[PDB]
């Protein structure tokens, strides 16, 4: 009963960051070494937990959150960051315990003339609560006139396509991200290292 981390990190399809995908992991053995000994990841930041000790720790639930963002924005997937991604798309709590793992997906998620399939939320009235997921498409009032579901000057669609081309500066190349959260409640600890 091996954890399907393969399903998560090696997936063919990754979600848009605004409508980020969550896998709840339970009832499996997690060999964490297969991640951290990998050469495949360019960012591997862990908050409040060490990947080397997870191999003999049990948790009630582990959450795998996956999505695509551009290189420049990987640094916004951290507690206490601000910017479009942090504020309007995916928000870590201050006291986050988990790992932030990312890799360049230019070979898959770029194409000549641009991949535009990947979106982000550009506008919102207020910041996301931590781990909030907002899939509303209500017209955004940017000026002093109410929109009531009609686009115009200062009345915009809240989402926008990233433009991923293979020649793009690394800052503007697509990155796949997985975020692992660890949960330890007073219930059967079903997510265990091999030891």
């Amino acid at each position, epitope marked *: 009963n091996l954890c399907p981390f393969g399903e998560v990190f090696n997936a063919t399809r990754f979600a848009s960051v605004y409508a980020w995908n969550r896998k709840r992991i339970s009832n499996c053995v997690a060999d964490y070494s297969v991640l951290y000994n990998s050469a495949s990841f360019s960012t591997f930041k862990c908050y409040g937990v060490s990947p080397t000790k997870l191999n003999d720790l049990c948790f009630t639930n582990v959450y795998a959150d996956s999505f695509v963002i551009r290189g420049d924005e990987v640094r916004q997937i951290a507690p206490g960051q601000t910017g479009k991604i942090a504020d309007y798309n995916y928000k870590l709590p201050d006291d986050f315990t988990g790992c932030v793992i990312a890799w360049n997906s230019n070979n898959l998620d770029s194409k000549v003339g641009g991949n*535009y*399939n990947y*979106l982000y939320r*550009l*506008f919102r009235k207020s910041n996301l609560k931590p781990f909030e997921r907002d899939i509303s*498409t209500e*017209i955004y009032q940017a000026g002093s006139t109410p929109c009531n*579901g*009609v*686009e115009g000057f200062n009345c*915009y*669609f*809240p*989402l*926008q*396509s990233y433009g991923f081309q293979p020649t793009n500066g690394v800052g503007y190349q697509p990155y796949r991200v997985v975020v692992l959260s660890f949960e330890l409640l007073h219930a059967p600890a079903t997510v265990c290292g091999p030891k």
Partner: nanobody, 127 residues
Framework: QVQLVESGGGLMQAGGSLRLSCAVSGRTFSTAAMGWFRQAPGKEREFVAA????????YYADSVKGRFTISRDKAKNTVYLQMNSLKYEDTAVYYC????????????????????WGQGTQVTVSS
């Protein structure tokens, strides 16, 4: 990929009204916006109207603003161009186009090159 098939072209009198359809089949979940373009014989293909698939918000070229209506039924994956107060200068082949591109700025669908295109439907406006 999606296939676009237009209908509703024919002979109509100036001052009358005529409604074109474009039915979208295949990978329809991708549709971000639909556009209508037209090409009068030997002259440039020209932007007419665009509709964002979400919300149904519309943008028109000045040439048809106040005359034409673009609308869509999502469930039926069909976009319509309602051509009211038909004029002699409307005589042309009309093309529907589909893009999965989302811009926050609706006016950009007037300049965007789209992903898939219909076969064109002839409208002939009588004197």
């Amino acid at each position: 990929q999606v296939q676009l098939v237009e209908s509703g072209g024919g002979l109509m009198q100036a001052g009358g009204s005529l409604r074109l359809s474009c039915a979208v089949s295949g990978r329809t979940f991708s549709t971000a916006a639909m556009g209508w373009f037209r090409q009068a014989p030997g002259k440039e293909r020209e932007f007419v109207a665009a509709i964002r698939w979400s919300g149904g918000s519309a943008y028109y070229a000045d040439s048809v603003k106040g005359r034409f209506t673009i609308s869509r039924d999502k469930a039926k994956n069909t976009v319509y161009l309602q051509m009211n107060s038909l004029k002699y200068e409307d005589t042309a082949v009309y093309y529907c186009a589909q893009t999965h591109y989302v811009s926050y700025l609706l006016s950009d669908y007037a300049t965007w090159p789209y992903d898939y295109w219909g076969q064109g439907t002839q409208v002939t406006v009588s004197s």
